[PDB]
């Protein structure tokens, strides 16, 4: 509070706080907010974060189906050390977990599986075409509204948030994140891809493939699967390990078939360069 | 290409960045068009004495009339409004901002760092943090390469087109007239004034209204109406450029 709208429930608490949902009034439609505090200065609103955030306003224009939208932005709060600044982004009812976990399909489908890996493929190549990107895409994240829809949500808000999430960091669930943000902090756009991978298999399964807690937790947890590398391909924060090997595919899955596996493994790889595109990886055998 | 794909999203992006054309009769109680065009002076010579992006000047007037067209303002207020537009100008397009100082520094301290700073956060709600509006100089370069012609040649382009944007941005038509519109005027007067004292050389320059308005996807006549507004301002300032005697 304040802002001309009108909260009406609440629809998640994730890494970005509490998510409302509101209406617009003289708008008469739905609204997804979310908020942040933000670093007061002798210089004002943060140069970056006002940047980040103009940039998401500026990426509605696109109008790119497979991206919700951040069609209002207000800062509410002004302090002497911080500012406070509520997000307007368009609403979308459930998220893709209320639609994996709502399955009655036990055990498919595959048509329903590869057109949706296709769209989000699509917003994330549209993203990172635009120098946007995610870092934390969960199955929360990722939105559909009744039509199949699928909005990427919570895209390219990391750095809006740097300083939140170091006041008083919070939960988490690395289950996610790519092997070099754990080792390291490479923040770059290949982390997003390998977040694709891990959401690719947990498809046809149904839950995370790497459901971990430490980020040392996390990693041998995928060493596991996709056996430990031998150098130079490793980065600079250990140290060594349980020498592991290239364990196949499907093990941990199936249902999936042939290239989809040969996918999910490009998708999988630890080395960020070699690792696949969304865009090469949007037009592979399997898709 | 990609060209196009951003460039429709621009131009629609830039739709939702217009002030309003009758903000003066509608909005504005205090504020009259001869007080802009004082405050336009004010804030281009501080973005020169400042050696400030070429951008910041026009991108703050653009929030300026942005502003006027939602809110109405005392003129005891407006340079503080103008101050603050430049403010957020330079925070998006400069590598070293214009600090807070800096700015009350140039109103000879008329207004304080913390007065600038509430005008920031009311500034930036009124727009909606819709700040990364696309800027007449990206329009310029665009256009630029789309364009057969030396790199020495487009370099004297950018320099006067740049000259005519700055000017059109202290006169009333830059609020009617969008950024992409304000940037083809503006290179159509440049690259066929260059030609003209230079046949043979600037040939980019032949029907480049019509070229232009395409890319632009604007009615070509309100383009050459543009340009002859353009170079009617620039004849202008034969006048003030002499009687700064008396």
Known sequence: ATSRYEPVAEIGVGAYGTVYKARDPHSGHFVALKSVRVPNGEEGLPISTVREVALLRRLEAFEHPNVVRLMDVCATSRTDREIKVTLVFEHVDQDLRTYLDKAPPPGLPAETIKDLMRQFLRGLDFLHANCIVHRDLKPENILVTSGGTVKLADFGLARIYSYQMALAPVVVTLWYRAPEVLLQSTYATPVDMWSVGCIFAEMFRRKPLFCGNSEADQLGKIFDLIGLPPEDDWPRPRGAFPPRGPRPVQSVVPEMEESGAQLLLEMLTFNPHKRISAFRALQHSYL | ?246
């Open chain 2, 1 to 246: 290409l990609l060209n196009d794909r951003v460039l429709r999203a621009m131009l629609k992006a830039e739709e939702t960045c217009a002030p309003s054309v009758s903000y003066f009769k509608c909005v504005q109680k205090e504020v009259l068009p001869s007080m802009r065009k004082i405050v336009a002076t004010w804030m281009l010579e501080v973005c020169e004495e400042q050696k400030c992006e070429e951008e910041v000047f026009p991108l703050a007037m653009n929030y300026l009339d942005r502003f006027l067209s939602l809110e109405p303002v005392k003129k005891s207020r407006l340079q503080l409004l103008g101050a603050t537009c430049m403010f957020v100008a330079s925070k998006m397009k400069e590598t070293i901002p214009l600090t807070a100082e800096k700015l009350c520094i140039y109103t000879d301290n008329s207004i304080r760092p913390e007065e600038l700073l509430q005008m920031e956060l009311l500034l930036v709600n009124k727009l909606k943090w819709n700040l990364a509006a696309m800027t007449p100089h990206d329009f310029i370069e665009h256009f630029l390469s789309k364009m057969p012609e030396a790199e020495e040649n487009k370099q004297i382009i950018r320099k006067h087109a740049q000259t005519f944007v700055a000017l059109c941005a202290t006169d009333v038509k830059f609020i009617s007239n969008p950024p992409s519109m304000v940037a083809a005027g503006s290179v159509v007067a440049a690259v066929q004034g260059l030609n003209l004292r230079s046949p043979n050389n600037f040939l980019s320059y032949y029907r480049l209204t019509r070229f232009l308005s395409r890319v632009i996807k604007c009615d070509p006549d309100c383009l050459r109406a543009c340009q002859e507004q353009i170079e009617a301002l620039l004849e202008s300032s034969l006048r003030q450029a002499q009687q700064n005697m008396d």
